[model samples]
Target chain A: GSRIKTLSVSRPIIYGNTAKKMGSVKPPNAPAEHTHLWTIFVRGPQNEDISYFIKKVVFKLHDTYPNPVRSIEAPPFELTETGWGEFDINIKVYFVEEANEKVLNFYHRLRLHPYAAEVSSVYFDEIVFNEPNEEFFKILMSR
Target chain B: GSRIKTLSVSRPIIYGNTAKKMGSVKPPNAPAEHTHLWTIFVRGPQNEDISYFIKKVVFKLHDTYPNPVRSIEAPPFELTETGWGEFDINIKVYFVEEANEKVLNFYHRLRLHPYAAEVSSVYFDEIVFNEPNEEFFKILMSR
Candidate 1:
């Protein structure tokens, strides 16, 4: 049977420059440091223990914490018999802005994450989503 | 210590307005008697025989195929249970202009999908990422 495909709304425009066009935003010299870290929990493949792996990874990245390294996630996700399935890890870090490259560099370093299929981004130039809250910082520091 | 709440990057943002904001082009019009559909496959829980249940849901949705979402393992990483945690069933629909309200109304009527949990805006907005490649229509004659 034939089918229908209809579209009646506007689509967003992606930034043309991509990674190349990204500019550097200078970090402000504040008296107190302002950084927030986060952890994401994703389901891993059946039979893999993701949490334990992350703990080990944390110990590996210990030297990077509380300074220039900003944040990191251990182990990433659990792998199943077939392959790595999902992930649940504690991410700890601090940064001036969520979109800053230093923070993104950490994300790049965690390529061990199972679902590193492809990387893409769309431009949302006008919207203003807020940064992480203070409570978030408190959690990462404890880890 | 307290931590920050983060957003899920795994989820897709598909609303028509946002799509336009992102860069999708509108699809063309189709005849009244038409349907467009795609399929996705999610793994079953560790102990459950989910094939039958998954197939039942697959049969219900029009022309949905088993596109791989991801494979994950369950582990004692976080406080959560380990196993085939859960499946995600998301649908992104594109509608024509001026008909967005009608499409949204139809979507609202479909809130009872058992596997559906977080239906998002891309499911409501009409801008399409792809154009339809099929055709079908029924005509009526009146005196």
Candidate 2:
């Protein structure tokens, strides 16, 4: 028998700079490529079914993002057969227009269901935008 | 003696839009406010309890751009002796990023639930961005 523990969720903002459980994605700080990154952890059973679990997660990704550009569940990394396996997947939800509120809201309420396992904790990083810099700063200041 | 005809729920997105809805305080867009919307209707014997006959619509806000800003429960907008009774009190579910998938999936599966009276209908308007003009240009150029 096996159980999931140490489960954590990381939601890095557009350019947030903070360490999450799995660490946060550093912003490229370039005009050519700009996007947000996220990290989620799901520890599978020690020696049960692999394909069944993977398939379940795959379905979750498909259902979570649904849209191609906005959501994509990358292949898992750091899978071990030593009775304990962890899956770290990076997800990116693209911004469509004017910092879409809906998309923002979606990310705002993102997480794994308790059925899988209660998320032990979650974290974020300090944010930094790569635009006029000053403009983003001023915007925040005004707020 | 009065009963609810419909229940509306609004889940707001509060973050930079990473889809992380865990205790998020800073909403993505300026003036930071959004909500999930649902509409429904019910029918029963005239002598039936109005509260018992209240309707419910499980709305599934797209986790993509223009995330559901708000949800409204509207009926024929009939004025009644029940003190201008609208459909019923709206039930709002603030968008929590972590619960996005589950909440959405719940609704998806709920529509097919055997127990409850079927969710009559649900919907939401495209999220209006903080910068409408910028969103407009992005729309023309493809963001």
Candidate 3:
């Protein structure tokens, strides 16, 4: 699909993590050394379907995890893990191949110290697609 | 103040309106036709000062407002008014004269009928300056 030159489009997205403190340790659920269980999500501004053009979301986690590099190839794109410390989590958003766009990267510092029943952290942002290809443009507008 | 060619800069901003219900119209105050007081604000990502590059905010209010075309020339660039109905507020963001840029325009539909202690409707967006002039660039970077 050829691109539509000089055309720019924007889409809003929300991404963040929420953590909950562990009052009691359970052997079957998570590692005993992990103190907090948190989940991160990346989706449309209003949680609407964005799979129309988002091919996948790749998450680069802390080294402590056995396999820190993770990939989510479908909707409700998210990841959940347990840890005792926090660090910057790297995210790479990949668009559909037809768009001929570059990968978008960002860092979200994992926050788990609030120690509340459930602590949440998130950011609001918009993704701009400049000169999207015809096929992808049709897909984007379809949404 | 001449621009640096092929360069682009982005700054995050939040804009929206919040309305509060009013019971009885009081004298020496807003018009009797007004039933709610709402305010609209545009500021930095975290309420930081953005006066360096933003020359002023020109607000095109509804015709019902006296002198509907209003301008806020300083920091805390915002507008407050009393109204009985809702309409789209046209906003024009004018950059510093040295930037050699056109005014940016957007519309925000004023919302007022949730009828709560106060209903908030705000959105986060980014202002992008493509190939801003050198002088304006320095001011933007300094801020």
**Can you write out model 3's per-residue Cα lDDT over B55-76, one digit (the tens) per residue?**
8998899888889999999989
Model 2 interface DockQ: 0.01
- Measured against the native two-chain assembly using Cα atoms, what DockQ does each of the candidate structures obtain, in the order listed? 0.02, 0.01, 0.01
lDDT of 1 by residue, B1-143 (tens): 11222211111222110101111332344222222212232222332332221112111122222332222223111111111112233322222232221221122112212232222122422222222111100000000
Candidate 2 wrongly placed segments (more than 4 Å): A1-89, A93-117, A130-134, B1-143
Report the error of model 3 at residue B30, Å. Answer: 1.8
lDDT of 2 by residue, B1-143 (tens): 11111112222211110011212344344233322212222222332322211222223334332333233234221111111111222323222222222222122211211234222232332222221222222232231
Tell me the fnat of candidate 2: 0.00
Clashes within 3 Å, all models in order: 35, 42, 3
- Using TM-score as the yardstick, the better of models 2 and 3 is 3
Off by over 4 Å in 1: A1-37, A40-48, A51-55, A58-65, A69-143, B1-53, B57-143
> What's the true lDDT of residue A143 in model 3?
81
> Model 3: how far is B36 from its true place, Å?
0.2
C-alpha lDDT (0 to 100) for residue B96 of candidate 1: 28
Best by lDDT: 3
TM-score of each: 0.15, 0.17, 0.50
Q: After superposition, how far is residue A96 of candidate 2 from its true place, in Å?
A: 8.8
Report the TM-score of candidate 2, chain A only: 0.24
